[PDB]
Write a protein that binds this DNA or RNA. Structure first.
Lengths: 215, 225
RNA sequence: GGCAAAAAAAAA
RNA sequence: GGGUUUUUCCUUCGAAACACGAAGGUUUUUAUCCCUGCC
């Protein structure tokens, strides 16, 4: 008889000033012993709603819960940038306690073009023989943006790793790092290393690069 | 004023044992229920155990008893979690949480520590080699330009990096480490600054990897004019 | 009408 | 039906999910207890 909490939806995205609603269904009766938590990336959850509908002291008025039998919602009346988070519902009606599987709320904002940078490999890293060309897209939106590498204009494949920050607490933008892992042998082999990106803040792809040793 | 502090996690080998501690300050653990709630990398939260006051009665999740055991030493206002028979599925951030006062918050968890990461792996710890990535000046870069430190080949997580020892925090972006095909982690942390002020100031990053026990600070400069 | 007695154990 | 004597159950409270404690609640199982004398 382990109660299961079924949270709806997994991910959603609304603009600022939007009204957004999260739902959880208890597999069986959990009375009203349900809490809601906000968890921002990297730090610990924070209690928003306890006892299914009561607002924990300090939380803004815009977060609210309520219950229809086994159907529990958390509505946030006017989405705000600070509210980008992952939200978890919890039943504490019986042991063991169970969390929902979570809802990752992002934020919709105006298209922001990435500011693109290229950094050559510094050679404490070619002091020990391999190469770290890296690309940077600073503060842009939306997330979905593709970045292509070339090396004397040669399309690259299977030697790229990308990592993108979480969405910002205050302006909602992203940023992304694409890094190409290749030899020292392949780094004096060719001369220039191009990074280009096709994101919809770009008329058509902006490109940045460098020579080897021309600074 | 209330505060909980987890410690004692880290890297352990499969089958190994670990004791987590939870140091409470600003309130007495005897008068509340204390819970351990765990979170895997990128997954959701999983309740693990808790002990209740006066009784001292304990309760466990099915994925963890026979193996985990929760206790509290009230004279050190500290709650522990003894972990034997550890397995890869036990790799997670472990939180210790206080259940709030009934009248004030029902059964909700009103205070959480910041979690201690437990890494169950057969792998051995390696510290990173931090490489700077240098700004682009033309002769000065008219407005703002970017620079950052590459942190490569380390295990396990985490590292922490700080520019001018915490002095510089605006425009920082420490990217989530990604795992190379090598089985080591590597991340980048970048900050943006006015090029106007590029040559008059020095840009330092304090990477730190307590698993390795490596503390390195490398400092960034342009190249030659 | 008015006093007095009496008497073991389970469950929601 | 009305009771006695025992348990449970439920609700509010005690820093309080169980355990312990305080104050409460209106129900019904017993061929497994009593419903008898006196002006």
């Amino acid at each position: 008889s382990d109660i299961q909490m079924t949270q709806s939806p997994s991910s959603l995205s609304a603009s600022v000033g939007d009204r957004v609603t999260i739902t959880c269904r208890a597999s069986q009766s959990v009375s009203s012993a349900v809490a809601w938590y906000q968890q921002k990336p990297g730090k610990a959850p924070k209690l928003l709603i306890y006892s299914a509908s009561s607002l924990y002291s300090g939380v803004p008025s815009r977060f609210s819960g309520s219950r229809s039998g086994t159907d529990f919602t958390l509505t946030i009346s006017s989405l705000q940038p600070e509210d980008f988070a992952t939200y978890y519902c919890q039943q504490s009606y019986s042991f063991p306690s169970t969390f929902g599987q979570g809802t990752k709320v992002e934020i919709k904002r105006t298209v922001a073009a990435p500011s693109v940078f290229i950094f050559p490999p510094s050679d404490e890293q070619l002091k020990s023989g391999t190469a770290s060309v890296v690309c940077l897209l600073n503060n842009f939106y939306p997330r979905e943006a593709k970045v292509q590498w070339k090396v004397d204009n040669a399309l690259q494949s299977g030697n790229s790793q990308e990592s993108v920050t979480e969405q910002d607490s205050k302006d909602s933008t992203y940023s992304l790092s694409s890094t190409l892992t290749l030899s020292k042998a392949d780094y004096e082999k060719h001369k220039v290393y191009a990074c280009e990106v096709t994101h919809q803040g770009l008329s058509s792809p902006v490109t940045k690069s460098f020579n080897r040793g021309e600074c | 004023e209330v505060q909980l502090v987890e410690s004692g996690g880290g890297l352990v080998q499969p089958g190994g044992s670990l004791r987590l501690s939870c140091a409470a300050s600003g309130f007495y653990i005897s008068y509340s229920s204390i819970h351990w709630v765990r979170q895997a990398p990128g997954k959701g939260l999983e309740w693990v155990a808790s002990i209740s006051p006066y009784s001292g009665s304990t309760y466990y999740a099915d994925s963890v008893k026979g193996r985990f055991t929760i206790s509290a030493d009230t004279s050190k206002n500290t709650a522990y979690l003894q972990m034997n028979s550890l397995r890869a599925e036990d790799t997670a951030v472990y939180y210790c949480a206080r259940q709030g006062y009934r009248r004030r918050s029902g059964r909700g968890f009103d205070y959480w520590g910041q979690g201690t990461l437990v890494t169950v792996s057969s792998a051995s710890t390696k510290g990173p080699s931090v490489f700077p990535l240098a700004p682009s000046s033309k002769s000065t870069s008219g407005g703002t330009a970017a620079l950052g430190c590459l942190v490569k080949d380390y295990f396990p997580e985490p590292v922490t990096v700080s520019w001018n020892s915490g002095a510089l925090t605006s425009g920082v972006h420490t990217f989530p480490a990604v795992l190379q095909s090598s089985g080591l982690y590597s991340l980048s942390s970048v900050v943006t600054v006015p090029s106007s002020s590029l040559g008059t100031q020095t840009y330092i990053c304090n990477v730190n990897h307590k698993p390795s026990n490596t503390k390195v600070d490398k400092k960034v400069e342009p190249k030659s004019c």
